[PDB]
Enzyme design. Sequence first.
Site, PDB file in Angstrom:
ATOM      1  N   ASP A 196      32.690  31.944  54.870  1.00 16.81           N
ATOM      2  CA  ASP A 196      31.383  32.226  54.295  1.00 16.81           C
ATOM      3  C   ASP A 196      31.447  32.162  52.779  1.00 16.81           C
ATOM      4  OD1 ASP A 196      32.334  34.977  53.388  1.00 16.81           O
ATOM      5  OD2 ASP A 196      32.018  35.609  55.468  1.00 16.81           O
ATOM      6  N   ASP A 198      30.021  34.420  49.481  1.00 13.79           N
ATOM      7  CA  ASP A 198      29.462  35.722  49.120  1.00 13.79           C
ATOM      8  C   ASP A 198      29.067  35.780  47.670  1.00 13.79           C
ATOM      9  OD1 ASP A 198      30.248  36.472  51.776  1.00 13.79           O
ATOM     10  OD2 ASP A 198      32.075  37.426  51.059  1.00 13.79           O
ATOM     11  N   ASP A 283      26.425  35.516  52.325  1.00 17.56           N
ATOM     12  CA  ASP A 283      26.070  36.926  52.176  1.00 17.56           C
ATOM     13  C   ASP A 283      25.643  37.192  50.747  1.00 17.56           C
ATOM     14  OD1 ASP A 283      26.978  37.340  54.865  1.00 17.56           O
ATOM     15  OD2 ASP A 283      28.985  37.786  54.107  1.00 17.56           O
TER      16      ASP A 283
HETATM   17  O1  LIG Z   1      41.642  38.268  53.184  1.00 18.43           O
HETATM   18  C1  LIG Z   1      40.984  39.285  53.416  1.00 18.43           C
HETATM   19  C2  LIG Z   1      39.436  39.424  53.358  1.00 18.43           C
HETATM   20  C3  LIG Z   1      38.660  39.937  52.123  1.00 18.43           C
HETATM   21  C4  LIG Z   1      37.782  39.043  51.609  1.00 18.43           C
HETATM   22  C5  LIG Z   1      36.412  39.024  51.417  1.00 18.43           C
HETATM   23  C6  LIG Z   1      36.092  37.690  51.644  1.00 18.43           C
HETATM   24  C7  LIG Z   1      34.896  37.070  52.042  1.00 18.43           C
HETATM   25  O2  LIG Z   1      34.073  37.619  52.795  1.00 18.43           O
HETATM   26  C8  LIG Z   1      34.694  35.753  51.541  1.00 18.43           C
HETATM   27  C9  LIG Z   1      35.359  34.654  52.152  1.00 18.43           C
HETATM   28  C10 LIG Z   1      35.184  33.366  51.623  1.00 18.43           C
HETATM   29  C11 LIG Z   1      34.339  33.161  50.478  1.00 18.43           C
HETATM   30  C12 LIG Z   1      33.623  34.180  49.816  1.00 18.43           C
HETATM   31  F1  LIG Z   1      32.794  33.962  48.699  1.00 18.43           F
HETATM   32  C13 LIG Z   1      33.846  35.465  50.394  1.00 18.43           C
HETATM   33  C14 LIG Z   1      37.241  36.992  51.445  1.00 18.43           C
HETATM   34  N1  LIG Z   1      38.235  37.824  51.271  1.00 18.43           N
HETATM   35  C15 LIG Z   1      41.697  40.552  53.841  1.00 18.43           C
HETATM   36  C16 LIG Z   1      43.226  40.619  53.993  1.00 18.43           C
HETATM   37  O3  LIG Z   1      43.881  41.289  53.000  1.00 18.43           O
HETATM   38  C17 LIG Z   1      43.734  40.853  55.465  1.00 18.43           C
HETATM   39  O4  LIG Z   1      42.891  40.989  56.443  1.00 18.43           O
HETATM   40  O5  LIG Z   1      44.994  40.914  55.702  1.00 18.43           O
END
Ligand SMILES: O=C(/C=C/c1cc(C(=O)c2cccc(F)c2)c[nH]1)/C=C(/O)C(=O)O
Length: 359
Positions: A196, A198, A283
């Site tokens: 996604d 955000d 989002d």
């Molecule tokens: O990687 C983990 C998620 C946190 C997080 C929030 C998001 C998004 O919602 C997101 C994705 C893509 C693009 C964008 F703009 C926003 C991305 N990283 C968590 C670990 O540390 C684990 O689960 O081990």
Amino acid sequence: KKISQYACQRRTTLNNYNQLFTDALDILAENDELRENEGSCLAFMRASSVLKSLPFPITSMKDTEGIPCLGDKVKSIIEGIIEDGESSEAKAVLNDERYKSFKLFTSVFGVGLKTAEKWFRMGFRTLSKIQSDKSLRFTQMQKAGFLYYEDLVSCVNRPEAEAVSMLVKEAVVTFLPDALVTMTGGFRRGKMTGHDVDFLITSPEATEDEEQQLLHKVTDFWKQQGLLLYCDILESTFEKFKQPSRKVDAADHFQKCFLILKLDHGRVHSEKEGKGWKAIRVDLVMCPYDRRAFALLGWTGSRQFERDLRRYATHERKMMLDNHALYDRTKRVFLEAESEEEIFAHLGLDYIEPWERNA
Ligand SMILES: O=C(/C=C/c1cc(C(=O)c2cccc(F)c2)c[nH]1)/C=C(/O)C(=O)O
Ligand code: NA
């Protein structure tokens, strides 16, 4: 120096030299989440996180000396991978019928742990058999999840994320021209792909009513333009003077919306057709101007970096941190911040760049 047990005191960049170990530990952690074993899940997540921070690959058990968060269970898994390049434990999980079904079913937008469990116990094993069933009743979120499945399961790349950023900015400034729109999540941390896109939206001069109406105005505009494929707006439950969350995993009380937008291929400036558009999960979060640094910090992630930030604040500084505020229990005052750097300074932490928060 000694590697800290806290992700907020480590620099975790996307050059992971220990993917052989962390992919196995991430599978084992995910299975413990499915098996409702929160404790074992947390232990594997912390071990995987610390190895992700290393500037070199583990090639012998001696290389693990002095690394925190590596219990005896975890060390047995590392030992096994060093032995033949594979994890027999993670291999067993990957071949487990419940684990396979949970991964497959939750890959649909609108399907979580409870619905995935329900379908498994009903004897379903494939998405084709679920979609074509004439007795099953689907939620509006799941209907969208199935209708746009192929597009949503394909990774969103940077040219697509930037195309969405242009659309978000163009729509937002139409109603609030002073608004600041920031791409958060994985893409802000330097990721090439994501499930996604955000965004954090804030306005220095908007009123409480203007702040509340923006996401409704922007989504109605896209609905008129035939770009809104799915929309769910969660109203704010934000409390200006409440103490920050004490919960392990803090909830976000800001106004937000979970969308599916129609992204026309002509808006994407990439190296590279079909229907000529792609469904994209987006989002949007709206926050009061004075809380913009706390919301940015919270929405940039990663999830493990956020967990450790809040745990460090509580256990080491007797401070309470969440997406909305920072409270000092000793000084009995809320601490103000105009940037993420000021939040790190209040906590007594050296600033960790967004691309160094991939814990
Ligand atoms: O990687 C983990 C998620 C946190 C997080 C929030 C998001 C998004 O919602 C997101 C994705 C893509 C693009 C964008 F703009 C926003 C991305 N990283 C968590 C670990 O540390 C684990 O689960 O081990
Ligand atoms: Na899902």
